[PDB]
Amino acid sequence: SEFMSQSNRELVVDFLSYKLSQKGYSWSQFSDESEAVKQALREAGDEFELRYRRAFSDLTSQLHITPGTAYQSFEQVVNELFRDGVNWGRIVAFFSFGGALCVESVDKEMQVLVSRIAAWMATYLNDHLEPWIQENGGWDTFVELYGNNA
Numbered sequence: 001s002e003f004m005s006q007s008n009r010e011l012v013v014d015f016l017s018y019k020l021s022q023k024g025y026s027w028s029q030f031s032d033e034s035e036a037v038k039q040a041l042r043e044a045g046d047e048f049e050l051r052y053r054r055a056f057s058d059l060t061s062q063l064h065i066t067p068g069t070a071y072q073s074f075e076q077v078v079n080e081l082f083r084d085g086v087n088w089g090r091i092v093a094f095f096s097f098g099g100a101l102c103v104e105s106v107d108k109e110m111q112v113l114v115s116r117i118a119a120w121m122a123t124y125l126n127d128h129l130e131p132w133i134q135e136n137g138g139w140d141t142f143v144e145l146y147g148n149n150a
């Protein structure tokens with residue numbers, strides 16, 4: 001409880017849909033307090049790209065991500081991102097990484113990867129990040145911290 005929560009799937013699809021919309025795409029092209037969390041994540045991901053733009057490179061070539069890639073390859077990269085533990089900034093970097101991997105996959109004519117990356121992100125969020133998030137005050141704590149720094 002939970003095996004795979006709908007709220008974790010929704011957070012991921014809403015974030016990825018936003019990043020793909022910024023590149024002119026609809027989520028439907030790739031796949032078949034809550035509003036405040038969605039908006040804070042959108043804003044934090046946009047700020048993360050302005051501050052750490054150099055990291056937004058040819059991710060699918062650097063990580064050899066193809067239509068043959070399975071979940072454990074994605075988990076190894078994200079475990080590197082969280083190698084020294086979890087914090088809010090690293091969670092924003094994780095969402096941003098998934099968004100950039102989706103955008104790059106579409107650019108490299110590997111549209112098939114988008115729904116897969118969404119599922120891998122929702123799995124990692126559910127299994128390896130939600131326990132930390134709940135222990136550290138929940139998503140409404142992030143909304144408060146982000147909004148107050150803003």
Ligand SMILES: Cc1c(C(=O)O)c(-c2cccc(N3CCN(c4ccc(NS(=O)(=O)c5ccc(N[C@H](CCN(C)C)CSc6ccccc6)c([N+](=O)[O-])c5)cc4)CC3)c2)c(-c2ccc(Cl)cc2)n1C
Pocket residue numbers: 044047048051052055056077078080081082087088089090092093094096097100146147149150
């Ligand atoms: C393996 C691996 C990687 C790897 O190993 O590192 C990386 C990788 C690559 C580059 C960068 C990073 N980062 C950079 C940042 N960093 C960090 C910094 C500070 C804190 N401290 S904090 O928690 O107190 C804090 C402080 C401030 C704010 N926010 C204010 C809002 C102000 N505003 C309201 C005015 C500022 S904006 C903002 C600032 C920082 C983070 C978010 C938003 C927030 N916050 O959450 O908003 C939280 C904690 C963590 C963690 C890692 C990872 C990738 C990767 C590859 C490609 C792509 Cl595309 C993505 C990822 N990969 C794959």
Ligand SMILES: [Zn+2]
Pocket residue numbers: 010014038
């Ligand atoms: Zn939603």
Ligand SMILES: [Zn+2]
Pocket residue numbers: 049056
């Ligand atoms: Zn961008």
Ligand SMILES: [Zn+2]
Pocket residue numbers: 075127128
């Ligand atoms: Zn795992």
Ligand SMILES: [Zn+2]
Pocket residue numbers: 131132135
């Ligand atoms: Zn913990």
